[PDB]
Design a binder for these strands. Structure first.
Ligand code: MG
Ligand code: MG
Ligand code: MG
Ligand code: MG
Ligand code: MG
Ligand code: MG
Ligand code: MG
Ligand code: MG
Ligand code: MG
Ligand code: MG
Ligand code: MG
Ligand code: MG
Ligand code: MG
Ligand code: MG
Ligand code: MG
Ligand code: ZN
Lengths: 25, 91, 150, 96, 200, 97, 226, 127
RNA sequence: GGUGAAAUUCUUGGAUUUAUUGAAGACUAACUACUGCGAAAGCAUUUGCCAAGGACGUUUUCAUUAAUCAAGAACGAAAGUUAGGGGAUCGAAGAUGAUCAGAUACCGUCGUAGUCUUAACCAUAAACUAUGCCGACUAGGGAUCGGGUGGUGUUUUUUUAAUGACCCACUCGGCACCUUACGAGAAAUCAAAGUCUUUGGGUUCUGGGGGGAGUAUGGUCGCAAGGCUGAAACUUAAAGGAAUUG
């Protein structure tokens, strides 16, 4: 691991959550 | 006060045509209706009559121009290119 | 020091120890105050008035030749300017740098330096208001700054 | 510099601004120098140069329009031609 | 009909006491009251009418004949111009580039107004509206609006018919196709999305 | 910790130095961090000029000289028997070999 | 390395060294040598007219070769063919240049480099680009190692040496100007006009380039070729 | 007496070129490369193939009429290496020993005033 | 041509190379260094115009106007966004050729967005001196930049003056470097990271075992990418700042 691509994994993760969240809204 | 936040001149379109398409129009409408500077009489009185036609209300001068701005950038670089080519022919 | 920079240059005058001077002087202050006021009648500020007397004539300071100071000498004769000489110079620099930006949008250096200048104008207007030399509710603004210089 | 010489003149010596005032000064012999803005109408330029040539008066061509020339003489409006009546403190007449 | 302004250029008749007037396409920069010079020794200034063989390489020219004497040809539309690439003095020819990006060799004595046509960038504005295209083509021609050919009946079009709206066969059509078969993408060498440069 | 005091370069009071590219691999190394080695040489040799000497008009003409300025990087310099490596005590010496 | 061309003729022998004629190159008058050498073109057939196939050639030769003495060692010269007659094609002044070795030797660290060029026109419509170069030097007894100019005298030097260049190029057209550059007399008035500023080592000026030309220029080369 | 030339040796890494020209260069004589006297496709810049080019050039130079020659050694230049390749100089040995005459040698590598940009990327050619 | 070797690739319709001329767009080599300027980011071809600025000198002027700062702001590399212009170089995606057990990688040939610019956003960087700012005192040495001071010093002009450029001594300000530790530190090291159990010059900001986690949530800014603000439940004795020996 390295912090750039654990930070990058989390952004693709945060992108995923707002996408599924807005469906309920 | 401040009647609108960001729509500006494109408030006339209401909620139509899409946000991005409304702001392409806003930029060119801002220029095409702006008052430009008279390069002959020295006044801020140049107005667009029709696409490419810019008439200065004072001194009654019409200059050919771009569709929405008096002088397009591509034209201005042309005018300088001809100049440097001119000033060497009779150099 | 150098509030609006990082410079630390200690470059200044060094007043002589002898509070009486110069021990080789010509006719006394009765003529000095007459010369100071006549240089003031043609619009020279006390800085310019002091420099001219200091070098052209021999005057170490008008403060030891005369018990008073040049500005107080001018003030007593009714020639004190509407704004103190120092504040008039910050204002004119602001007017000059403001006009430059009106020709150069992209000069962000002028943007930084104009901000610093007006802050010095504000910290002097605030100080001059407490002293009551300047009236209160006196504010510097860009609209009337150009007319205030001249 | 040309700007400071005008600035020294602008406050010491009398003068006239604009076209009609310049012409009467050129006519009556009061003028000793005129300044011509860059974007002035060339037909107007020719008539001024004719009187100057016909009254033995110098002519200067400022490198700027009526906008800057008015600012160069310390005014907030546009000046196309200015006829100085006397230098007063500066040395514009003896130079150039 | 066009989006480029036109100029009324007036000349004196060289053979009669007459004031023959010309209808040119205005160059961006041309103004009422200008002076226009038209000849072989005329200067290199925008608004002047000069031959291709008598202008230096790299010149910006518009309203350019491609046979000397046509009184007007390519680079007529708003914001369009021509540039000279290289002269061939003997067997006089001039190498120029067209607004399409094409290199064309034409007679050295062909003419053209120096500069660029006024009205550049006329197409950067979205019409935003059906009725805006109504006035663009109220004065051009009746080629608007366009029913799709796939939204038709087979009697009325090659692409019409079928239980779903579709082409059915390839929409890429050959050169040798006849009037009636040529509907779609004529003579296409490739298609799809433009990936890469012009590769000309 | 800090391996050295300047610690990469001569940048002290600049922030930016407008870097250059390595002569071997084109790496965008900072100019003051570079390993400049001025190369000066004769146009041909110091040994084979004998053969060229008899085959020349203008006897002892000039034997001109070839100059160069080579910008290597840390990886390129160390790899090719250049300034590669020293002892911790001898890294203070700023005099050339 | 020979069997690596997959195809030699995509569309599917005589030796040509029996069909050239060697000509002779003449340098203009203000060079103590005019015999430069010999060039080649094919036979001037009825459809080729090889006279103009060598009309625009430019030849590069050292100025020491034209002047004989080798102290004009670097001083490169290019010569332009103007008119051709009887195997004896004439050739005139096309430029001047420095060899790579000396121009690079001129430049060293711990001294400020000064460039100055002008684009003035002479009387014969020859528009030239006249460059320059100079370097402040380490004075005799100099203790400090830098001798850097104060970067405001540099522009003063650039002003003075460019005023001189414009002044003499006007009035000296093509042979006096060429005979001006030969003794480096221009440099001698550069050093005494600037010695009040810095020593200015190595004022060997720079290359010179012709920009534009007059008409074909044929009515007086009597003094250009004798 | 001596009829000069312009040898124009351009032999960088991966190749070797020798070809003489006329006084103006517009006319060339006797071109041959390091790739035509060996079969490796790798020894094109080898020292031997550099001489073998300059041996065949000097062989044809004497049968055209040129007896002297000026030399111009060239590297790739530009944003590229700027140094002469392994064979850029061995060609000098072959022509000097062949019998041709030499004068006014110099290096003519194209050197910019910091022209545009090198290839290989910012991190460089990594291997 | 390319490479470790090759191959994709261009070539007898002339590739490379040579010669001649032209165009495009970008960069600004060598000079260029323990040197300059700027609040930092950053900034190097030339000249003109505009405004600004540090240092210096000052027997000029005002007179405590000052130091640092919640909230609030200006600027802020590169990448990125929107709209044009430009699009010569290089070039995230991709197509190929390799390499390989695989290679969607490193390497080779091409190659779009961008690199460039105007207008407007973006507010990040190992944005590092990983050293906040202001002020004071405490050890030696040389070098240099700007200004200055003195010296029958040297050179060039008009042998000869003034100047200018050098030399010597000193000084004010600055970018730095060298030696040592009485001092500090956890050591590495440090003239500041000293003047701290002999513990107090002023002031701003930040931290409290490692993770979960810069995540969740609610606001807020942004066109978007995301920035700012920012937990808990739960988990658990387990990586280094630093040096030593292998
Ligand atoms: Mg201080
Ligand atoms: Mg930085
Ligand atoms: Mg060819
Ligand atoms: Mg410097
Ligand atoms: Mg430079
Ligand atoms: Mg503060
Ligand atoms: Mg951060
Ligand atoms: Mg930090
Ligand atoms: Mg401190
Ligand atoms: Mg010092
Ligand atoms: Mg400094
Ligand atoms: Mg805790
Ligand atoms: Mg914790
Ligand atoms: Mg345990
Ligand atoms: Mg450790
Ligand atoms: Zn008008």
């Amino acid at each position: 691991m390295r912090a750039k691509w654990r930070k990058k994994r989390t952004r693709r993760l945060k992108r995923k959550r707002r996408k599924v969240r807005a469906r309920s809204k | 006060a401040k009647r609108t936040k960001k729509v500006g001149i494109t408030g006339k379109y209401g909620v139509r045509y899409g946000s991005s398409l409304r702001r392409q129009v806003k930029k060119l409408e801002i220029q095409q209706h702006a008052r430009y500077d008279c390069s002959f009489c020295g006044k801020k009185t140049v107005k667009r009559g029709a696409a490419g036609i810019w008439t200065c209300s004072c001194c009654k001068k019409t200059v050919a121009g771009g569709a929405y701005t008096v002088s397009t950038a591509a034209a201005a670089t042309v005018r300088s290119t001809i100049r440097r080519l001119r000033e060497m022919v009779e150099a | 020091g150098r509030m609006h920079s990082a410079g630390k240059g200690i470059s200044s005058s060094a007043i002589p120890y002898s509070r009486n001077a110069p021990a080789w002087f010509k006719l006394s202050s009765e003529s000095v105050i007459e010369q100071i006021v006549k240089y003031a009648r043609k619009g020279l500020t006390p800085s310019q008035i002091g420099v001219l007397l200091r070098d052209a004539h021999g005057v170490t300071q008008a403060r030891v030749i005369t018990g008073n100071k040049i500005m107080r000498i001018l003030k007593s004769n009714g020639l004190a300017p509407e704004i103190p000489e120092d504040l008039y110079y910050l204002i004119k620099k602001a007017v000059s740098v403001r006009k430059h930006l009106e020709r150069n949008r992209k000069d962000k250096d002028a943007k930084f330096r104009l901000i610093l200048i007006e802050s010095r104008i504000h910290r002097l207007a605030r100080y001059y208001r407490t002293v009551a030399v300047l009236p209160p509710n006196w504010k510097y603004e860009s609209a009337t700054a150009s007319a205030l210089v001249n | 510099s040309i700007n400071q010489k005008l600035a020294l003149v602008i406050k010491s010596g009398k003068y006239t601004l604009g076209y009609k005032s310049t012409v009467k000064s050129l006519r009556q012999g009061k003028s000793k120098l005129i300044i011509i803005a860059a974007n002035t109408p060339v037909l107007r330029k020719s008539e001024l140069e004719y009187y100057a040539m016909l009254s033995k008066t110098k002519v200067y061509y400022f490198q700027g329009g009526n906008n800057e020339l008015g600012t160069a003489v310390g005014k907030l409006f546009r000046v196309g031609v200015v006829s100085i009546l006397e230098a007063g403190d500066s040395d514009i007449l003896t130079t150039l | 009909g066009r989006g480029a302004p036109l100029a009324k250029v007036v000349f004196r008749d060289p053979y009669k006491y007459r004031l023959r007037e010309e209808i040119f396409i205005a160059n961006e920069g041309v103004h009422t009251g200008q002076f226009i010079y038209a000849g072989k020794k005329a200067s290199l200034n925008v608004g002047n009418v000069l031959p291709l063989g008598s202008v230096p390489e790299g010149t910006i020219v518009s309203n350019v004949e491609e046979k000397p004497g046509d009184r007007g040809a390519l680079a007529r539309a708003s914001g369009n111009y021509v540039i000279i690439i290289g002269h061939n003095p003997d067997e006089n020819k001039t190498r120029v580039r067209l607004p399409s990006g094409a290199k064309k060799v034409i007679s050295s004595d062909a003419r053209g107004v120096i500069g660029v046509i006024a009205g550049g960038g006329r197409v950067d504005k979205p019409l935003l509206k059906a009725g805006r295209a109504f006035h663009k083509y109220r004065l051009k021609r009746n080629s608007w609006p366009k029913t799709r050919g796939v939204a038709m009946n087979p009697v009325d079009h090659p692409h019409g018919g079928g239980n779903h709206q579709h082409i059915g066969k390839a929409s890429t059509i050959s050169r040798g196709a006849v009037s009636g078969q040529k509907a779609g993408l004529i003579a296409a060498r490739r298609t799809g999305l433009l990936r890469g440069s012009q590769k000309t | 910790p800090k391996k050295r005091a300047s610690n990469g370069r001569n940048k002290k009071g600049r922030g930016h130095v407008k870097p250059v590219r390595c002569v071997n691999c084109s790496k965008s190394i900072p100019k003051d961090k570079a390993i400049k080695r001025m190369a000066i040489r004769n146009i041909v040799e110091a040994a084979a000029v004998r053969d060229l000497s008899e085959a020349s008009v203008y006897p002892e003409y000039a034997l001109p000289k070839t100059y160069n300025k080579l910008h290597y990087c840390v990886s390129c310099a160390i790899h090719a028997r250049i300034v590669r490596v020293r002892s911790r005590e001898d890294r203070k010496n700023r005099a050339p070999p | 390395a020979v069997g690596k061309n997959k195809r030699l003729s995509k569309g599917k022998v005589v030796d040509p060294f029996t069909r050239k004629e060697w000509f002779d190159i003449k340098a203009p008058s203000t060079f103590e040598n005019r015999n430069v050498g010999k060039t080649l073109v094919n036979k001037s057939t009825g459809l080729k007219s090889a006279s103009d196939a060598l009309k625009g050639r430019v030849v590069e030769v050292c100025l020491a070769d034209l002047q004989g003495s080798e102290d004009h060692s670097f001083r490169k010269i290019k010569l332009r063919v103007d008119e051709v007659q009887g195997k004896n094609l004439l050739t005139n002044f096309h430029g001047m240049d420095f060899t790579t070795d000396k121009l690079r030797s001129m430049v060293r660290k711990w001294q400020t480099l000064i460039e100055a060029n002008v684009t003035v026109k002479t009387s014969d419509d020859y528009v030239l680009r006249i460059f320059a170069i100079a370097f402040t030097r380490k004075q005799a007894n100099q203790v400090k190692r830098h001798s850097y100019a104060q970067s405001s005298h540099i522009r003063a030097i650039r002003k003075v040496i460019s005023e001189i260049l414009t002044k003499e190029v006007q009035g000296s057209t093509l042979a006096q100007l060429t005979s001006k550059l030969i003794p480096e007399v221009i440099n001698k008035e550069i050093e005494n006009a600037t010695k009040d500023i810095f020593p200015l080592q190595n004022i060997h000026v720079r290359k010179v380039k012709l920009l534009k030309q007059p008409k074909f220029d044929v009515g007086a080369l009597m003094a250009l070729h004798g | 007496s001596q009829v000069f030339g312009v040898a124009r040796i351009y032999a960088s890494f991966n190749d070797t070129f020798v070809h003489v020209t006329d006084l103006s260069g517009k006319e060339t004589i006797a071109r041959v490369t390091g790739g035509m006297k060996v079969k490796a496709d790798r020894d094109e810049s080898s020292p031997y193939a550099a001489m073998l080019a300059a041996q065949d050039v000097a062989a044809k130079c004497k049968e055209v009429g040129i007896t002297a020659v000026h030399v111009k050694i060239r590297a790739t230049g530009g944003t590229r290496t700027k140094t002469p390749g392994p064979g850029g100089q061995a060609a000098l040995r072959a022509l000097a020993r062949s019998g041709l005459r030499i004068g006014r040698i110099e290096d003519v590598t194209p050197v910019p005033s910091d022209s545009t940009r090198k290839k290989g990327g910012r991190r460089g050619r990594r291997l």
